[PDB]
Symmetry: D2
Subunit: 209 residues, 4 copies
């Protein structure tokens, strides 16, 4: 029952979850509450990370392909994505360029991106209408095309994701997705998430937001 | 759901995320029973196995170390095991019963084999306890303990990699001892994912024993 | 070790390094029985034996590094193979060259199309040209590259290194060297198989005969 | 082949290796649409990658080792899943009379109410007994896979290990560390020594910036 909107048309939604902070506690003890919290912080502070592999999430994510390509680099997880063989685009708002000294107003940049999207999309449609197969015609669509996928990932792998994506060195667009993931993660695994931030999280932005 | 295995072993279900429909939701990126089972068979038939990765199990398993070592070779999974260095170890060992060996032509009664194995276990254990009480640390004293010592672990595994495990272990070329664990894993799996299990047996299962049970 | 195969108009697969060979698998399998290498007949026989019974772990000790140039829509299909290592050209950090996969008119064989295949090719070029010049002007106005590149189409060429062991490479071939896979990636898979054949003749023959699931490699 | 003896009958032996320090430089440079530069430039990128946590470029360096080690050691080792293993089988082979017998020096450091050499002989006695029983079981037609269960955890096994440099570093972090059992520390020292020999720059940079363990910053 948890969806977060990201960018102009994207989202992250929680599809399912196995376990909670106690799943990592059982695993670390190999047995089927102030003590439990303490073991959580204890595991986290000593980098005993494998217990956290026994908490698992499945997300449904709508994201632009350029964001998805960074995301899918995370190999310790499962993905199923929408197929372009078998249509909406991320248009940055003007604010995206604030802090940059551009020769053309931020609003004009937005418009040019939006113009290319429009032109590429119409080329695609015309190709399809010509009888060009989809797998060929879609190649003209830009990297800001929205795709969707299911992402299944354990809490350990998700921490690693947060380390590298919830960080000002990461592209701002994916950091937004990472913040949504962290928020869901915090909801479901408050003890682990709190210990993670305190002892093991390597990025900067979840300390600031 | 807990199943006894061998003399002191068990496979116990701790948790599961999803069911056959999780694999359907994922293949479609989004319930109609006949259509959804059909998709299941279609995925399994054409080897499109990633959707089954979105079903996941956690088990708690108690097994002898010679069995755990065969098990732990399956890398696409998560493990937490008892140590070893940090616990005093229980007097628990797999001693095969005479039925394990009847069938084999042996020059001594099957029962005397049981007795011989028991005797050595008992001696190893005594040595261990002696070294323990003498101050030798556990991590050193336990090296005298035989491979039939029972250990316990938590095993977290998705339905795709579990199917791989069943391919390899639910099979008469695998050691009899681990076959028995696989039969219990197959039962829990069938109970939680009947459609995936049936489609697996029908289309992708490479072993021999699961279609006998 | 070095090989290079050109693919599509401007792509390639280049072999950068390799560890091991058919005998690497033979040795690793042999340790099971407390044995090492034997002789050519027996060792070749063993490779086939391993392949027939699906004993795939010994082939993990054969390892390749490729340097691949490919359009993003192909790279995206390729990078779904998780049991492997990648490093790729960055659109955030580098300024991208004008290189796009333009399909030739023949790519449309057996399709009845409304406009001549040549027009499709030229329509694809036009949109590409337009998207690219927009990217350049965004870059020139001080737009960061990571934003500017979002207007670039899926047929932009990217480059990457791919390190992959023989087992995982066989898994790749089963799925990509197959007529249900998109033609463009089938072409890269053919190049991959060709290099694999060259460096591991026995494994490769054995794979084709006993295990390979696709159709295009026959 | 680089082969280093460990414990009383143990060894770690380099079988093969793909790539070198410059393999990581090449992989990293592709991000900036670049290749190799020169000596002092490329060594500095190695340091830079390690200092900032860019680990993936080190995946393109790969090693194969042949390791002989006690089963209690292999069991800890094999927990490292991002690697490839093939091991001697007690199902398919008649096992050799080779067991790890700790030297008396393994025990000083600890107060014991029996002398360390007594500990050493108590271990041998149990090994001898178990091994003789094993042979007797085999001799009676007890199949190997069953007979071997009486053999103690200190039995030597052998395996091939193929592992990339990033995952080798993870291994050094965990096993070349005083918290790991002394026996496996010793293997991890040999591993480190071969690593260092093949990839001197990656290795120095790893010690300087990324290595979490304690012992490799003191054992040469
Ligand atoms: C013709 C055609 C058409 C499509 C697709 C492929 C092909 C060939 N795919 C891709 C497919 O779903 C899959 O993502 C890739 O083929 C990757 O294959 P593996 O997972 O086998 O390789 P990968 O290298 O990921 O795995 C290699 C082997 O490791 C194992 N493995 C690795 N990680 C694992 C894990 N976490 N759990 C369990 N086992 C694991 C598996 O046993 C696998 O055989 C797809 N995808 C999609 O999302 N949507 C689509 O519409 C399509 N369409
Ligand atoms: C001193 C000491 C003491 C102990 C243990 C280790 C050490 C060093 N361990 C072992 C520990 O729990 C762990 O299993 C091993 O260190 C394997 O380590 P990695 O998973 O980091 O390596 P591995 O090669 O398995 O993985 C390496 C890297 O890949 C990632 N990764 C790989 N597979 C993954 C997956 N499926 N999910 C998420 N991320 C994944 C991780 O990010 C990790 O950094 C243990 N174990 C135990 O069970 N009981 C015990 O009592 C002890 N005691
Ligand atoms: C800010 C920023 C900037 C960039 C990049 C990331 C970030 C955050 N990256 C991506 C990076 O190189 C990498 O692909 C992803 O971060 C995935 O990281 P992991 O391998 O940690 O996750 P993944 O989920 O793949 O693995 C998690 C853990 O498992 C282990 N592991 C898994 N598989 C392994 C294997 N085969 N070998 C060894 N260890 C393994 C690692 O120990 C890791 O800690 C990149 N990439 C790029 O190619 N070019 C670029 O220019 C950039 N730029
Ligand atoms: C009857 C019998 C007899 C034996 C053995 C097994 C069985 C069933 N084995 C074990 C066998 O070699 C192997 O270790 C296990 O079957 C684990 O198999 P997977 O690699 O499929 O599981 P795992 O979970 O390791 O892999 C799951 C899937 O992921 C893929 N994958 C994961 N990691 C990969 C990687 N790094 N590279 C490429 N692909 C990867 C594979 O495609 C695989 O299907 C063995 N072993 C041995 O050493 N000596 C022996 O003598 C024997 N004897
Ligand atoms: O042969 C294929 C075809 C698609 N995929 C993957 C790549 C993407 O993550 C999705 C959708 O790819 P598409 O090319 O749009 O059909 O599936 C693949 O891995 N291999
Ligand atoms: O049937 C087998 C035999 C061996 N293995 C693996 C487990 C160990 O790492 C080695 C040796 O196991 P063994 O039970 O000794 O045959 O190979 C296995 O997974 N399955
Ligand atoms: O120091 C250690 C101790 C245990 N492990 C792993 C190996 C086994 O699965 C368990 C228990 O090992 P033990 O040596 O019994 O403490 O944890 C490890 O990787 N490193
Ligand atoms: O910040 C980044 C940059 C690149 N990557 C990965 C994702 C792609 O495979 C390549 C190219 O990414 P790019 O967004 O073009 O910089 O590197 C990433 O994961 N995170």
């Amino acid at each position: 029952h948890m969806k977060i909107d990201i960018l102009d048309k994207g989202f992250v939604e929680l599809v399912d979850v196995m376990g909670n902070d106690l799943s990592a506690v059982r695993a670390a003890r190999v047995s089927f509450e102030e003590r439990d919290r303490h073991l959580i912080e204890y595991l986290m502070k000593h980098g005993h990370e494998t217990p956290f592999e026994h908490i698992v999430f499945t997300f449904h994510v709508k994201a632009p392909i350029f964001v998805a390509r960074q995301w899918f680099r995370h190999r310790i997880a499962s993905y199923n994505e929408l197929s372009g063989r078998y249509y909406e685009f991320y248009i940055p708002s003007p604010e995206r360029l604030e802090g940059y000294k551009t020769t053309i107003p931020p609003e004009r940049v937005t418009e040019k991106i939006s113009e290319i999207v429009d032109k590429a999309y119409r080329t695609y449609l015309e190709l399809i209408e010509s009888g060009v197969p989809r797998e060929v015609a879609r190649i003209v669509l830009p990297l800001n095309l929205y795709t969707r996928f299911f992402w299944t990932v354990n809490a350990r792998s998700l921490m690693n994701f947060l380390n590298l994506k919830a960080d000002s060195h990461a592209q701002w667009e994916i950091q937004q997705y990472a913040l949504a993931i962290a928020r869901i993660f915090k909801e479901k695994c408050p003890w682990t998430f709190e210990a993670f931030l305190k002892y093991a999280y390597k990025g900067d932005i979840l300390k600031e937001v």
